[PDB]
Design an enzyme around this catalytic site. Structure first.
Site, PDB file in Angstrom:
ATOM      1  N   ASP A  82     -69.127  -9.080  28.275  1.00 11.96           N
ATOM      2  CA  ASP A  82     -68.424  -7.808  28.388  1.00 11.96           C
ATOM      3  C   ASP A  82     -67.246  -7.965  29.386  1.00 11.96           C
ATOM      4  O   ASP A  82     -67.430  -8.479  30.490  1.00 11.96           O
ATOM      5  CB  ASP A  82     -69.446  -6.775  28.887  1.00 11.96           C
ATOM      6  CG  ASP A  82     -68.925  -5.364  28.886  1.00 11.96           C
ATOM      7  OD1 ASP A  82     -68.001  -5.062  28.108  1.00 11.96           O
ATOM      8  OD2 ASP A  82     -69.473  -4.541  29.663  1.00 11.96           O
ATOM      9  N   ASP A 104     -60.410  -9.202  27.603  1.00 16.57           N
ATOM     10  CA  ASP A 104     -59.809  -7.923  27.899  1.00 16.57           C
ATOM     11  C   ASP A 104     -58.518  -8.141  28.661  1.00 16.57           C
ATOM     12  O   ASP A 104     -58.526  -8.370  29.875  1.00 16.57           O
ATOM     13  CB  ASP A 104     -60.751  -7.084  28.754  1.00 16.57           C
ATOM     14  CG  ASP A 104     -60.158  -5.750  29.133  1.00 16.57           C
ATOM     15  OD1 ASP A 104     -58.982  -5.492  28.786  1.00 16.57           O
ATOM     16  OD2 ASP A 104     -60.874  -4.964  29.792  1.00 16.57           O
ATOM     17  N   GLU A 134     -59.004  -5.786  23.208  1.00 17.40           N
ATOM     18  CA  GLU A 134     -58.793  -4.362  23.496  1.00 17.40           C
ATOM     19  C   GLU A 134     -57.318  -3.986  23.435  1.00 17.40           C
ATOM     20  O   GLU A 134     -56.461  -4.732  23.896  1.00 17.40           O
ATOM     21  CB  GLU A 134     -59.349  -3.995  24.886  1.00 17.40           C
ATOM     22  CG  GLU A 134     -59.241  -2.514  25.224  1.00 17.40           C
ATOM     23  CD  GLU A 134     -59.917  -2.141  26.553  1.00 17.40           C
ATOM     24  OE1 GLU A 134     -59.977  -2.980  27.471  1.00 17.40           O
ATOM     25  OE2 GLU A 134     -60.407  -0.999  26.682  1.00 17.40           O
ATOM     26  N   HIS A 200     -65.658   1.695  24.039  1.00 12.66           N
ATOM     27  CA  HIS A 200     -66.046   1.489  25.432  1.00 12.66           C
ATOM     28  C   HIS A 200     -66.240   2.844  26.067  1.00 12.66           C
ATOM     29  O   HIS A 200     -65.745   3.844  25.549  1.00 12.66           O
ATOM     30  CB  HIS A 200     -64.959   0.723  26.174  1.00 12.66           C
ATOM     31  CG  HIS A 200     -65.016  -0.746  25.933  1.00 12.66           C
ATOM     32  ND1 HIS A 200     -65.335  -1.649  26.922  1.00 12.66           N
ATOM     33  CD2 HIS A 200     -64.867  -1.465  24.795  1.00 12.66           C
ATOM     34  CE1 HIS A 200     -65.338  -2.867  26.413  1.00 12.66           C
ATOM     35  NE2 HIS A 200     -65.055  -2.780  25.124  1.00 12.66           N
ATOM     36  N   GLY A 201     -66.960   2.885  27.184  1.00  8.30           N
ATOM     37  CA  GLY A 201     -67.126   4.126  27.927  1.00  8.30           C
ATOM     38  C   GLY A 201     -67.866   5.172  27.124  1.00  8.30           C
ATOM     39  O   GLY A 201     -67.506   6.354  27.168  1.00  8.30           O
TER      40      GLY A 201
HETATM   41  O1  LIG Z   1     -67.670   0.296  28.214  1.00  7.98           O
HETATM   42  C1  LIG Z   1     -68.603   0.217  28.962  1.00  7.98           C
HETATM   43  C2  LIG Z   1     -69.611   1.369  29.037  1.00  7.98           C
HETATM   44  O2  LIG Z   1     -69.197   2.426  29.842  1.00  7.98           O
HETATM   45  P1  LIG Z   1     -70.207   3.651  30.301  1.00  7.98           P
HETATM   46  O3  LIG Z   1     -71.605   3.244  30.172  1.00  7.98           O
HETATM   47  O4  LIG Z   1     -69.909   3.982  31.872  1.00  7.98           O
HETATM   48  O5  LIG Z   1     -69.879   4.919  29.334  1.00  7.98           O
HETATM   49  N1  LIG Z   1     -68.491  -0.628  30.145  1.00  7.98           N
HETATM   50  O6  LIG Z   1     -67.384  -1.470  30.325  1.00  7.98           O
HETATM   51  C3  LIG Z   1     -69.433  -0.493  31.247  1.00  7.98           C
HETATM   52  C4  LIG Z   1     -68.875   0.063  32.561  1.00  7.98           C
HETATM   53  C5  LIG Z   1     -69.757   0.938  33.451  1.00  7.98           C
HETATM   54  C6  LIG Z   1     -69.017   1.815  34.465  1.00  7.98           C
HETATM   55  O7  LIG Z   1     -69.258   1.618  35.831  1.00  7.98           O
HETATM   56 CL   LIG Z   2     -59.237  -3.208  29.792  1.00  9.96          CL
HETATM   57 NA    NA Z   3     -67.245  -5.360  25.338  1.00 14.18          NA
HETATM   58 ZN   LIG Z   4     -66.024  -1.297  28.854  1.00 15.86          ZN
END
Ligand SMILES: O=C(COP(=O)(O)O)N(O)CCCCO
Ligand SMILES: [Cl-]
Ligand code: NA
Ligand SMILES: [Zn+2]
Ligand SMILES: O=C(COP(=O)(O)O)N(O)CCCCO
Ligand SMILES: [Cl-]
Ligand code: NA
Ligand SMILES: [Zn+2]
Lengths: 297, 297
Positions: A82, A104, A134, A200-201
């Site tokens: 990741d 990334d 990305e 992501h996120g």
């Molecule tokens: O894309 C992902 C998942 O993000 P998240 O689990 O915070 O929605 N990540 O890169 C993990 C980062 C964690 C933040 O401190």
């Molecule tokens: Cl990034």
């Molecule tokens: Na990833």
């Molecule tokens: Zn991420």
């Protein structure tokens, strides 16, 4: 078994479901994620960030995953780096036995991102490893992914999956005000790239998890995650890998806090971490059902 | 690397020092123990109880230790089944790749003990694995070890090392009133057996560890461990393996509690477990210096 990332994601792409990609930093997180996958009959992306790899040692990260895969050989699993930040980082992951790597360079100029990504792809494909890259900047709603950039980027790099920024961001504080994502933009990226896409996120901060954490004296003021219905919409729009980390952490630590608060004489590690694992496992199981990877083995 | 337990304890026996035997239940504990051994240039006994093996799975228990041995190939390490309760448990451990097993049937009558222990030894020695047995019940000050019983027991069982009960007990609450151990009994047992000897319930509960745990809101009312001076006296008396578990847990969990207390918004697992690992590692390092295994590689 342990398989290249693209094998799991091409099936999800073909059938229109999303596969959770869950971060781990140690044995407890890893065990809980595998048990969830076993209980929901779901394939798994297991992810390790560069920080996680430094904490564990890349040897232990891969080693633990290989042991777990042998424990549950019927579960398709990809082991994924990741947010790899350099060519060397990706190279080391490939050498150690990762089956998927993310390079990334989203904050580089388009041509620099493309050149670096293409360099990683050449190296990883030579080793039978899949690659994620990305485009766009991960933040709440130039900024977001440019679909025509994505079309060219994917064609020229031959990257296996792409993470397009559509309005999520990392961590527990994704939205001030009502959640919003650019699903029209997502759909255009999907049409133009026709590859698996990565969100992501994607943590939701579910109500029961928030409640668990707050009940244990935790502070989550202002926190807001992606609504469940938005995660479902994202999958319908072509997201096939859904990165999830924050939800897992909050659920796990809530249980650790609870024991610490309640029994001041307790110092058996298992008494903190068995409940912590259970809560993490349940988060993952519900998420597998939501994204549709449940019952896809 | 991974070696038979007797390889380590015979050298300790010959040169008159003690080797700490440290329990682990997960990656954090194990990593801290190995980093301590590496910094102190000390051989290690790493042990896992049946309970820990249930928690980790025996495949993961052994698997993680092998990866750690590959990371620090210069460190002599025995992987030891702590308090094995049945022949079948000892056999499973041997097949899984343990290099040392304890068969604990001290609660049986002397001849039952010898019978079971002898069966385990035959199986273990046949697979190149060392064996520990116990005589006496492990409480404070009929119960304690009978030196003449030990003499016969060792000669006929062929067990590699013996745990004679001399006044220690498991856990944080070893003594009411000032600690006392039967060192005369110890010395007689050593004279009659002339093999490596094992002290159970050997945690000291160090002042700084207690202080850390109490400062973080923990409760250790009435706890007392073995004085450092007593551990040194045990080694002088013929103890070569010193089982330590409680000290590690308390130092670890003290840091977890402290982190929980100091930041209610904190849910990065590494932020809890990095300080915990460090506190555990320091307990182990100090113990290695105390027992005299520092710089014995
Ligand atoms: O894309 C992902 C998942 O993000 P998240 O689990 O915070 O929605 N990540 O890169 C993990 C980062 C964690 C933040 O401190
Ligand atoms: Cl990034
Ligand atoms: Na990833
Ligand atoms: Zn991420
Ligand atoms: O002899 C011991 C450890 O003794 P201590 O409790 O002094 O650490 N063991 O064999 C480990 C398990 C006992 C539970 O504490
Ligand atoms: Cl016993
Ligand atoms: Na033992
Ligand atoms: Zn013991």
């Amino acid at each position: 078994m342990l398989v290249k990332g693209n094998e799991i994601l091409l099936k999800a792409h073909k059938e229109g479901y999303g596969v959770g990609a869950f971060n781990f930093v140690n044995f407890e997180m890893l065990n809980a994620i595998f048990e969830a996958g076993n209980e929901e009959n779901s394939p798994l992306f297991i992810q390790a960030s560069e920080g996680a790899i430094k904490y564990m040692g890349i040897d232990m990260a891969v080693g633990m995953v290989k042991i777990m895969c042998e424990r549950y050989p019927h579960i398709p699993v990809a082991l994924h780096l990741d947010h790899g930040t350099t060519f060397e980082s990706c190279e080391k992951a490939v050498k150690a036995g990762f089956t998927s790597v993310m390079i990334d360079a989203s904050h580089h100029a388009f041509e620099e991102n493309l050149e670096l990504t293409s360099k990683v792809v050449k190296m990883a494909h030579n080793a039978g490893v899949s690659v994620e890259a990305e485009l766009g900047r991960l933040m709440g709603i130039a900024v977001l992914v440019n679909p025509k950039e994505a079309e060219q980027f994917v064609k020229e790099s031959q990257v296996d999956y792409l993470a397009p920024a559509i309005g999520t961001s990392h961590g527990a504080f994704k939205f001030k005000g009502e959640p919003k994502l650019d699903f029209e933009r997502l759909q255009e990226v999907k049409r133009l790239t026709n590859i698996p896409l990565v969100l992501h996120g994607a943590s939701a901060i579910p109500d029961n998890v928030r409640k668990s954490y707050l009940d244990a004296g935790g502070d989550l003021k202002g926190s807001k995650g992606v609504p469940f219905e938005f995660l479902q919409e994202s999958v319908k729009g072509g997201i096939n890998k859904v990165n999830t980390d924050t939800d897992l952490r909050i659920a796990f630590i809530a249980e650790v806090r609870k024991v610490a608060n309640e029994d001041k004489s307790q110092f058996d590690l298992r008494k903190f971490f068995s409940p912590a694992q259970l809560a993490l496992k349940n988060v993952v199981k519900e998420r597998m059902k939501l994204l549709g990877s449940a019952n896809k083995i």
